[PDB]
């Protein structure tokens, strides 16, 4: 009669909360999805071992098209857990699943966990200053999405920071790197000429948030575009005007140039 | 040798991540602050019991004025942890404490935890649509804060949602309710008259996020301003233009008026 949406957190199998782990252990059935994002610092086997339960992985179609046929039936007469990377319901499509639960006569509860949306606070940038968020998607065929460029423009215009989620081919386990993201943005700039993202733009890269050793780097595009930020996942941030306290953190903690103190404050 | 900033999560002691617990358990000294937020479902004793260490609570003055005199000295010869509600670097000024650690020759690490900033996903509103955030501060003396009103206006103009952190007076044990926040906004509206926040404005309230049964309610101010949302902490949200799926969730899960389903595109 109960469905639990449990977040797995940021990077490895220990990023789940104590509450989530204990609840998952008591569930009769445990499902999971790894298409909204991945858990780069662990494996399905390591998560299964920690939970002590067999974990049935569901694809995007399994969830979007057949959630009520695969998960809800068992949730009708048993305690069922649905695991997702990060914090449940941050991914736009998750919320709706709670409605399906209601219509199936199944109760649902949400067990939160850290999300990159909030973890970016480790960059030293004030969370309240983050504006609208966006995703940089790989272009392909004759399709070249550029909406994320406009998000940056509108946020920076109001002195706000822009969080850019980078594309990921979950099934193929291919992660877009911050370098690839910067290359694309310069390419979009060259096409839109809005002076939004250039070699002189200050950016912040956060890699492997959740790990005890994430890479946090800040600097101008011209200097970071070919820097090695380590293994995925990577997140790119284009900050707006900085509070001096933000700038000092970037310099002291993220190795940013002293120049940002006079150019971006 | 090291200093750990470990988040405790949204509501109770089990909201800490497994990573944070295992690390805290092995630290020599454990400090904490409980003035940046309110964990309404636990107590110091329960947290102490879970971690198996005596937790020394620090006041805002202890931290802001003497963090380097109380915490850092020990971190030079021991493994020290600093616990905080939610995520240690979200809507707090704790990030700057990492600079003090550095300048003191102390390596610091951050362990994230569920944050109210991302937990808002449970309201059904798309996280990427949230714009700048703000804090509704208690007026004091002849000083009546109003900056949060302009944040809502700017976000609403762009079709973005606004997350409003509500004030807290930890030592005085005062936790601002959504009702009180709504009252203050109506007053600011009377002054500025920007038509930003009125009796007809649609709002969303989230109370005690993190608990298994948080209060999630959506409706018009005139109808919710006197409603009982349960014990604090509370958060208030002023949605921008809604996607149909957001409206459906607000109606099905947050009990909003069915008329909002009819979106004005
Ligand atoms: N569990 C909860 N439920 C509802 N609101 C919460 C909450 N936790 C925090 N808040 C809101 O956020 C304010 C504190 S600001 C600090 C937030 C904390 N660092 C975090 O990451 O969660 C509270 O006064 C309240 O307005």
From Swiss-Prot, chains A, B:
<comment type="subunit">
    <text>Homodimer.</text>
</comment>
<feature type="binding site">
    <location>
        <position position="10"/>
    </location>
    <ligand>
        <name>S-adenosyl-L-methionine</name>
    </ligand>
</feature>
<keyword id="KW-0808">Transferase</keyword>
<comment type="similarity">
    <text>Belongs to the diphthine synthase family.</text>
</comment>
<feature type="binding site">
    <location>
        <position position="166"/>
    </location>
    <ligand>
        <name>S-adenosyl-L-methionine</name>
    </ligand>
</feature>
<dbReference type="InterPro" id="IPR014777">
    <property type="entry name" value="4pyrrole_Mease_sub1"/>
</dbReference>
<protein>
    <recommendedName>
        <fullName>Diphthine synthase</fullName>
        <ecNumber>2.1.1.98</ecNumber>
    </recommendedName>
</protein>
<keyword id="KW-0489">Methyltransferase</keyword>
<comment type="pathway">
    <text>Protein modification; peptidyl-diphthamide biosynthesis.</text>
</comment>
<feature type="binding site">
    <location>
        <position position="87"/>
    </location>
    <ligand>
        <name>S-adenosyl-L-methionine</name>
    </ligand>
</feature>
<dbReference type="GO" id="GO:0032259">
    <property type="term" value="P:methylation"/>
</dbReference>
<dbReference type="InterPro" id="IPR000878">
    <property type="entry name" value="4pyrrol_Mease"/>
</dbReference>
<feature type="binding site">
    <location>
        <begin position="115"/>
        <end position="116"/>
    </location>
    <ligand>
        <name>S-adenosyl-L-methionine</name>
    </ligand>
</feature>
<dbReference type="InterPro" id="IPR004551">
    <property type="entry name" value="Dphthn_synthase"/>
</dbReference>
<feature type="binding site">
    <location>
        <position position="234"/>
    </location>
    <ligand>
        <name>S-adenosyl-L-methionine</name>
    </ligand>
</feature>
<dbReference type="Pfam" id="PF00590">
    <property type="entry name" value="TP_methylase"/>
</dbReference>
<keyword id="KW-0949">S-adenosyl-L-methionine</keyword>
<comment type="function">
    <text>S-adenosyl-L-methionine-dependent methyltransferase that catalyzes the trimethylation of the amino group of the modified target histidine residue in translation elongation factor 2 (EF-2), to form an intermediate called diphthine. The three successive methylation reactions represent the second step of diphthamide biosynthesis.</text>
</comment>
<dbReference type="GO" id="GO:0004164">
    <property type="term" value="F:diphthine synthase activity"/>
</dbReference>
<dbReference type="GO" id="GO:0017183">
    <property type="term" value="P:protein histidyl modification to diphthamide"/>
</dbReference>
<feature type="binding site">
    <location>
        <position position="209"/>
    </location>
    <ligand>
        <name>S-adenosyl-L-methionine</name>
    </ligand>
</feature>
<feature type="binding site">
    <location>
        <position position="90"/>
    </location>
    <ligand>
        <name>S-adenosyl-L-methionine</name>
    </ligand>
</feature>
<dbReference type="InterPro" id="IPR014776">
    <property type="entry name" value="4pyrrole_Mease_sub2"/>
</dbReference>
<dbReference type="InterPro" id="IPR035996">
    <property type="entry name" value="4pyrrol_Methylase_sf"/>
</dbReference>
